[PDB]
């Protein structure tokens, strides 16, 4: 169809012109003007929590777009999924893993 290829062209021009304008104003900023510790493991902990819960989030992303055709059995499976996810979250909170201060 003409509409889909036209919008693909429009999206391509959008990306190209955005990148070109941004790097162009970088070029204008550079071109003008005259010249003259050890971290803690808590950052890794919260980042790995974020990664695991983003994979849980991707599963819920796949579920949420097709609730109507999956029916009530999909609701039951996602309820078990979400209950396991919340049990893991309560486990992380209760043992002081998610508490930033010691």
């Amino acid at each position: 169809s003409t509409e889909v290829i036209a919008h693909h062209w429009a999206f391509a021009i959008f990306l190209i012109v955005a990148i070109g304008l941004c790097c162009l104003m970088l070029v204008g900023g550079w071109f003008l003007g005259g010249r003259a510790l050890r971290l803690s493991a808590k950052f890794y902990l919260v980042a790995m929590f974020f990664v695991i819960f983003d994979v849980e989030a991707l599963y819920l992303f796949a579920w949420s777009t097709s609730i109507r055709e999956s029916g009530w059995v999909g609701f039951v499976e996602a309820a078990i999924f979400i209950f396991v996810l919340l049990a893991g979250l309560v486990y992380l909170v209760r043992i002081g893993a998610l508490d930033w201060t010691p």
Partner: protein, 300 residues
Amino acid sequence: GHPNLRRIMMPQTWKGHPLRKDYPARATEFSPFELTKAKQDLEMEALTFKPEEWGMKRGTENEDFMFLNLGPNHPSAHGAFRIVLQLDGEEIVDCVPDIGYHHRGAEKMGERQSWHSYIPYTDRIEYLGGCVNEMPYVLAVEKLAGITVPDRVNVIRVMLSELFRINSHLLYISTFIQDVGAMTPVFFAFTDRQKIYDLVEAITGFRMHPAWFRIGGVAHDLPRGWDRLLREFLDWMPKRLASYEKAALQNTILKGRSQGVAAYGAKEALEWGTTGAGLRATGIDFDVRKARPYSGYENF
């Protein structure tokens, strides 16, 4: 028997002792070579810091005690000062304050000015205080001269000291609220400070350091119509103060940031010599205006 007897007002490489009578008071010759030398000292101090001469122990012995420098540049009204923090994650294991970055030699200047011309130097001891800073010096000189000021002098000096106290408290509350994170109360409190400054400009002729108290009285008389400005200020204040409380001082985010942080009892306040609101927050009712009254504060 002192644990770490090092210099606190002058840098460690400073020959002589300034408050001795055989030491010259005026400024010595300036040299950019010494400026470059002290710049080099600052540059290798940030890279080759040795947490031993400051009295600290455990110089990153736990392999995670990171070292931070807060100052010396400080984007706030307190002024320039340094704290060297030893940190375990976010916990402050130990800190050594480094002061002396605002030493003007006011006592040595006290040995160099007369009793009359030293009053402006008494103003700039605490620049949020002004006449409150002028008051104890002129009272002590009146004790030395055997002067008993009349009642009108006492009421005038109480008026100006209370006005500058309101000014300082407004600045303090606004700066604390800005340190928590709210922005509008500093603008509003500085508008109120401008009202105070209008009245103080009418009375003395200056905003921050009036230099208006004298040995035995004040410089001039009250101008014809000061009561109108005082009435305008007293009508302007309390609604705005209640608005400040409601807008920022009752916010639960500010309460979570401020309640229970750096708490100490009465024993810690007494053993460290903390006075003022820090002593009266411990329940020790010790105000100088009520315990050892001065300048007609009994009449109020």
